[PDB]
Amino acid sequence: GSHMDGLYINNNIPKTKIVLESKPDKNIFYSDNYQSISQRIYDDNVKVLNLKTGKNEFPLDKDIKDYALYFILPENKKTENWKYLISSDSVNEFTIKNDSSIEKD
C-alpha cells in the first residue's frame, strides 16, 4: 500500500472499540486486561474510540514515538492477539477478521 505513517484498521465486527494510549508503560501493557484499561480512561494519554466496520484511520502524534493499541471486541469476548505496541514513525495496518482474529499487516 501507499499509506504513510499512521494507524489503519479494517474491521469486520460491529461494535468493536479500540483503546489508544500514548507513552504506555510497557510493564502495565503486558499485564493489562479489559478491566485494568477501563480504570485509565480518564487519563490524558488515553482515548477510547469506536471502530466502524470497514476502513478506519486514527491520528497519531509524530512527537509521541510509542503507543499502546488495545482491541476491545464486543460482549466481553477475548481474542488472542488483541494488544500491540506501535510507533507513530511506522505504517500500522490491522485487520479484524470475521472470526474475530486480528492480523497486523
C-alpha span between 58 and 78 (Å, rounded): 23
Residues 37-66 that bind its own copies (CB under 8 A): 38-39, 41-42, 44, 47-48, 50
* Contacted by 83, from Br ion, its own copies, none: CB < 5 to 8 Å by type: none
φ, ψ of residue 71 in degrees (nearest 5): -95, 125
Instruction: State yes or no: residue 52 binds Br ion (CB under 5 A).
Output: yes
φ, ψ of residue 104 in degrees (nearest 5): -100, 125
Q: Which is nearer to its own copies, 70 or 94 (by Cβ)?
A: 70
Question: Under DSSP, is residue 35 helix (H, G, I), strand (E, B) or coil?
Answer: helix
Per CB under 8 A, residues contacting its own copies are: 15, 17, 34, 38-39, 41-42, 44, 47-48, 50, 72, 74, 76
